[PDB]
Design a protein around this motif. Sequence first.
Motif, PDB file in Angstrom:
ATOM      1  N   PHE A  90       0.764  -1.313  -0.039  1.00  0.00           N
ATOM      2  CA  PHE A  90       0.000   0.088   0.128  1.00  0.00           C
ATOM      3  C   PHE A  90       1.008   1.185  -0.115  1.00  0.00           C
ATOM      4  O   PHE A  90       2.084   1.143   0.456  1.00  0.00           O
ATOM      5  CB  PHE A  90      -0.975   0.083   1.092  1.00  0.00           C
ATOM      6  CG  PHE A  90      -0.542   0.238   2.514  1.00  0.00           C
ATOM      7  CD1 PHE A  90      -0.015   1.558   3.022  1.00  0.00           C
ATOM      8  CD2 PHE A  90      -0.449  -0.631   3.500  1.00  0.00           C
ATOM      9  CE1 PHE A  90       0.411   1.530   4.119  1.00  0.00           C
ATOM     10  CE2 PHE A  90      -0.101  -0.731   4.698  1.00  0.00           C
ATOM     11  CZ  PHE A  90       0.427   0.559   5.186  1.00  0.00           C
ATOM     12  N   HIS A  91       0.237   2.387  -0.658  1.00  0.00           N
ATOM     13  CA  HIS A  91       0.923   3.638  -0.488  1.00  0.00           C
ATOM     14  C   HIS A  91      -0.022   4.658  -0.648  1.00  0.00           C
ATOM     15  O   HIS A  91      -1.046   4.378  -0.668  1.00  0.00           O
ATOM     16  CB  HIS A  91       1.956   3.750  -1.971  1.00  0.00           C
ATOM     17  CG  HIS A  91       1.003   3.588  -3.154  1.00  0.00           C
ATOM     18  ND1 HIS A  91       0.661   2.335  -3.684  1.00  0.00           N
ATOM     19  CD2 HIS A  91       0.446   4.540  -3.624  1.00  0.00           C
ATOM     20  CE1 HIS A  91      -0.050   2.768  -4.810  1.00  0.00           C
ATOM     21  NE2 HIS A  91      -0.280   3.923  -4.826  1.00  0.00           N
ATOM     22  N   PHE A  92       0.349   6.111  -0.592  1.00  0.00           N
ATOM     23  CA  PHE A  92      -0.505   7.085  -0.677  1.00  0.00           C
ATOM     24  C   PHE A  92      -0.173   8.243  -1.888  1.00  0.00           C
ATOM     25  O   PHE A  92       0.956   8.351  -2.331  1.00  0.00           O
ATOM     26  CB  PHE A  92      -0.445   7.802   0.797  1.00  0.00           C
ATOM     27  CG  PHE A  92      -0.608   6.900   1.802  1.00  0.00           C
ATOM     28  CD1 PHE A  92      -0.016   6.116   2.624  1.00  0.00           C
ATOM     29  CD2 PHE A  92      -1.779   7.207   2.681  1.00  0.00           C
ATOM     30  CE1 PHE A  92      -0.224   5.366   3.757  1.00  0.00           C
ATOM     31  CE2 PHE A  92      -2.378   6.478   3.794  1.00  0.00           C
ATOM     32  CZ  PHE A  92      -1.515   5.411   4.289  1.00  0.00           C
ATOM     33  N   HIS A  93      -1.131   9.000  -1.922  1.00  0.00           N
ATOM     34  CA  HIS A  93      -0.926   9.863  -2.864  1.00  0.00           C
ATOM     35  C   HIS A  93      -1.640  11.499  -1.851  1.00  0.00           C
ATOM     36  O   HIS A  93      -2.338  11.132  -1.227  1.00  0.00           O
ATOM     37  CB  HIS A  93      -2.019  10.000  -4.093  1.00  0.00           C
ATOM     38  CG  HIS A  93      -1.430   8.718  -4.959  1.00  0.00           C
ATOM     39  ND1 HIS A  93      -0.465   8.881  -5.819  1.00  0.00           N
ATOM     40  CD2 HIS A  93      -1.803   7.475  -4.827  1.00  0.00           C
ATOM     41  CE1 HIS A  93      -0.128   7.666  -6.600  1.00  0.00           C
ATOM     42  NE2 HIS A  93      -1.110   6.870  -5.931  1.00  0.00           N
ATOM     43  N   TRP A  94      -0.825  12.553  -1.887  1.00  0.00           N
ATOM     44  CA  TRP A  94      -1.039  13.615  -1.120  1.00  0.00           C
ATOM     45  C   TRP A  94      -0.671  14.875  -1.563  1.00  0.00           C
ATOM     46  O   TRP A  94      -0.202  15.107  -2.715  1.00  0.00           O
ATOM     47  CB  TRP A  94      -0.467  13.569   0.477  1.00  0.00           C
ATOM     48  CG  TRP A  94       0.906  13.185   0.477  1.00  0.00           C
ATOM     49  CD1 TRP A  94       1.748  14.495   0.636  1.00  0.00           C
ATOM     50  CD2 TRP A  94       1.886  12.355   0.313  1.00  0.00           C
ATOM     51  NE1 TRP A  94       2.947  14.003   0.659  1.00  0.00           N
ATOM     52  CE2 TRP A  94       2.958  12.753   0.574  1.00  0.00           C
ATOM     53  CE3 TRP A  94       1.609  10.960   0.136  1.00  0.00           C
ATOM     54  CZ2 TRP A  94       4.279  11.989   0.229  1.00  0.00           C
ATOM     55  CZ3 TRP A  94       2.824   9.968   0.081  1.00  0.00           C
ATOM     56  CH2 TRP A  94       4.179  10.434   0.183  1.00  0.00           C
ATOM     57  N   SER A 102      -5.921  13.709  -3.246  1.00  0.00           N
ATOM     58  CA  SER A 102      -6.539  12.681  -3.756  1.00  0.00           C
ATOM     59  C   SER A 102      -6.460  12.788  -5.289  1.00  0.00           C
ATOM     60  O   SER A 102      -6.209  13.525  -6.023  1.00  0.00           O
ATOM     61  CB  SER A 102      -8.058  12.630  -3.481  1.00  0.00           C
ATOM     62  OG  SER A 102      -8.768  13.448  -3.925  1.00  0.00           O
ATOM     63  N   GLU A 103      -6.295  11.409  -5.998  1.00  0.00           N
ATOM     64  CA  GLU A 103      -6.551  11.340  -7.147  1.00  0.00           C
ATOM     65  C   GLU A 103      -7.823  11.086  -7.992  1.00  0.00           C
ATOM     66  O   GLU A 103      -8.249  11.911  -8.770  1.00  0.00           O
ATOM     67  CB  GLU A 103      -5.503   9.979  -7.759  1.00  0.00           C
ATOM     68  CG  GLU A 103      -4.229  10.139  -7.267  1.00  0.00           C
ATOM     69  CD  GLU A 103      -3.165   9.197  -7.953  1.00  0.00           C
ATOM     70  OE1 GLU A 103      -3.336   7.823  -8.044  1.00  0.00           O
ATOM     71  OE2 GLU A 103      -2.251   9.807  -8.391  1.00  0.00           O
ATOM     72  N   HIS A 104      -8.633  10.360  -7.398  1.00  0.00           N
ATOM     73  CA  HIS A 104     -10.153  10.290  -7.470  1.00  0.00           C
ATOM     74  C   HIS A 104     -10.772  11.305  -6.793  1.00  0.00           C
ATOM     75  O   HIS A 104     -10.219  11.920  -5.827  1.00  0.00           O
ATOM     76  CB  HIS A 104     -10.797   9.064  -7.154  1.00  0.00           C
ATOM     77  CG  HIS A 104     -10.458   7.825  -7.837  1.00  0.00           C
ATOM     78  ND1 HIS A 104      -9.279   7.005  -7.802  1.00  0.00           N
ATOM     79  CD2 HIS A 104     -10.806   7.102  -9.081  1.00  0.00           C
ATOM     80  CE1 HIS A 104      -9.063   5.945  -8.513  1.00  0.00           C
ATOM     81  NE2 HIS A 104      -9.895   5.988  -9.546  1.00  0.00           N
ATOM     82  N   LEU A 115      -5.400   6.636  -0.047  1.00  0.00           N
ATOM     83  CA  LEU A 115      -4.584   5.558   0.157  1.00  0.00           C
ATOM     84  C   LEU A 115      -4.907   4.308  -0.922  1.00  0.00           C
ATOM     85  O   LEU A 115      -6.210   4.290  -1.288  1.00  0.00           O
ATOM     86  CB  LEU A 115      -5.082   4.916   1.548  1.00  0.00           C
ATOM     87  CG  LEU A 115      -4.802   3.305   1.897  1.00  0.00           C
ATOM     88  CD1 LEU A 115      -3.311   3.098   2.019  1.00  0.00           C
ATOM     89  CD2 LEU A 115      -5.606   3.275   3.241  1.00  0.00           C
ATOM     90  N   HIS A 116      -3.932   3.755  -1.336  1.00  0.00           N
ATOM     91  CA  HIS A 116      -4.141   2.515  -2.251  1.00  0.00           C
ATOM     92  C   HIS A 116      -3.728   1.230  -1.983  1.00  0.00           C
ATOM     93  O   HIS A 116      -2.601   1.025  -1.594  1.00  0.00           O
ATOM     94  CB  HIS A 116      -3.488   2.954  -3.717  1.00  0.00           C
ATOM     95  CG  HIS A 116      -4.157   4.047  -4.614  1.00  0.00           C
ATOM     96  ND1 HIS A 116      -3.576   4.721  -5.376  1.00  0.00           N
ATOM     97  CD2 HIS A 116      -5.237   4.656  -4.287  1.00  0.00           C
ATOM     98  CE1 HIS A 116      -4.503   5.744  -5.919  1.00  0.00           C
ATOM     99  NE2 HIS A 116      -5.536   5.719  -5.521  1.00  0.00           N
ATOM    100  N   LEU A 117      -4.371   0.317  -1.482  1.00  0.00           N
ATOM    101  CA  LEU A 117      -3.988  -1.082  -1.458  1.00  0.00           C
ATOM    102  C   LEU A 117      -4.183  -1.956  -2.575  1.00  0.00           C
ATOM    103  O   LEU A 117      -5.031  -2.203  -2.886  1.00  0.00           O
ATOM    104  CB  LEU A 117      -5.057  -1.555  -0.204  1.00  0.00           C
ATOM    105  CG  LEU A 117      -4.992  -0.593   1.294  1.00  0.00           C
ATOM    106  CD1 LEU A 117      -6.264  -0.451   1.726  1.00  0.00           C
ATOM    107  CD2 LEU A 117      -4.130  -1.446   2.314  1.00  0.00           C
ATOM    108  N   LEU A 194      -3.361   1.737 -13.988  1.00  0.00           N
ATOM    109  CA  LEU A 194      -2.348   2.103 -12.751  1.00  0.00           C
ATOM    110  C   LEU A 194      -2.372   3.819 -12.933  1.00  0.00           C
ATOM    111  O   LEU A 194      -2.672   4.241 -14.087  1.00  0.00           O
ATOM    112  CB  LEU A 194      -0.840   1.588 -13.132  1.00  0.00           C
ATOM    113  CG  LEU A 194      -0.681   0.050 -13.176  1.00  0.00           C
ATOM    114  CD1 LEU A 194       0.737  -0.236 -13.641  1.00  0.00           C
ATOM    115  CD2 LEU A 194      -0.998  -0.520 -11.930  1.00  0.00           C
ATOM    116  N   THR A 195      -2.176   4.461 -11.978  1.00  0.00           N
ATOM    117  CA  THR A 195      -2.143   5.967 -12.241  1.00  0.00           C
ATOM    118  C   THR A 195      -0.694   6.587 -11.987  1.00  0.00           C
ATOM    119  O   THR A 195      -0.494   7.672 -12.016  1.00  0.00           O
ATOM    120  CB  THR A 195      -2.767   6.537 -10.740  1.00  0.00           C
ATOM    121  OG1 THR A 195      -2.188   6.327  -9.675  1.00  0.00           O
ATOM    122  CG2 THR A 195      -4.223   6.147 -10.829  1.00  0.00           C
ATOM    123  N   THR A 196       0.165   5.694 -12.031  1.00  0.00           N
ATOM    124  CA  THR A 196       1.745   5.837 -12.358  1.00  0.00           C
ATOM    125  C   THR A 196       1.988   5.213 -13.645  1.00  0.00           C
ATOM    126  O   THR A 196       1.739   3.907 -13.700  1.00  0.00           O
ATOM    127  CB  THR A 196       2.521   5.857 -11.238  1.00  0.00           C
ATOM    128  OG1 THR A 196       2.271   4.661 -10.608  1.00  0.00           O
ATOM    129  CG2 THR A 196       2.251   6.778 -10.068  1.00  0.00           C
TER     130      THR A 196
HETATM  131 ZN   LIG Z   1      -1.501   4.839  -6.484  1.00  0.00          ZN
END
Ligand SMILES: [Zn+2]
Length: 257
Positions: A90-94, A102-104, A115-117, A194-196
């Motif tokens: 898991f990792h985060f975007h901030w 957030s991405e969404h 948070l992405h699990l 994927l968002t990256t």
């Molecule tokens: Zn992510």
Amino acid sequence: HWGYGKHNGPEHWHKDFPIAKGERQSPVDIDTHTAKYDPSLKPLSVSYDQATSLRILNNGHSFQVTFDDSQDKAVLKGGPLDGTYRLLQFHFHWGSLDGQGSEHTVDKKKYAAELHLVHWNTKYGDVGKAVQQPDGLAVLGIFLKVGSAKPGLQKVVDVLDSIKTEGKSADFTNFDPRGLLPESLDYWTYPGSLTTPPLAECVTWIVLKEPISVSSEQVLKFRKLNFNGEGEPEELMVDNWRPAQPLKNRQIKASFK
Ligand SMILES: [Zn+2]
Ligand SMILES: Nc1ncnc2c1ncn2CC(=O)NCCc1ccc(S(N)(=O)=O)cc1
């Protein structure tokens, strides 16, 4: 190489990864009034009681906690999924400020973090094979808003000072991801990517309606990390999110009325 700056950020990614402009890219805006309630969707099955965390790592675009995925120890099933998906990391975007990160988005609303699990379909044996499949991965997304602290996150934030810069890692055992989940497992779901990079179109997205609350002190610890490696000019690790992409020919389904 790619990043989140003016000259290498999300608007540049398509040059190395042309699927960035594809038909099922993520993230997207979730229009809550256009999502279709689907009473044929099952409840999500989150089985994390035997999770085995291993390490925590600054990879230059986020920080991630990695799990032993050599066995069915922490698995996602049900919901819209067929079969069993193993938790990898898991990792985060901030954001740089609480009103973005957030991405969404939900009715164009941005949260402070996401948070992405990340799970992969055991059908395909390893995550490298799964990313090449349209149903290879299931990512469970959880929004973070700023307010009360989330006690279960504190073990994470307290070790970030030891992985400040790109490439640092530390052992990180006996961390229980159940302490990051909100009460409700009500969710939206749609096919995406994927968002990256490599932005592969291999993800079933499962986004929880209910955000978790975290404290300002907790998110400020995120914002002290570094994009750079030790010995390079300091660039704070903030605004490591991709903005919403066009929905195109997709429908977002809701598990809830
Ligand atoms: Zn992510
Ligand atoms: N520790 C490990 N063991 C085995 N294989 C591993 C591994 N680490 C990485 N790989 C390869 C891999 O995972 N590629 C996918 C990367 C990814 C991008 C974006 C999202 S996101 N932002 O959409 O959620 C989620 C995941």
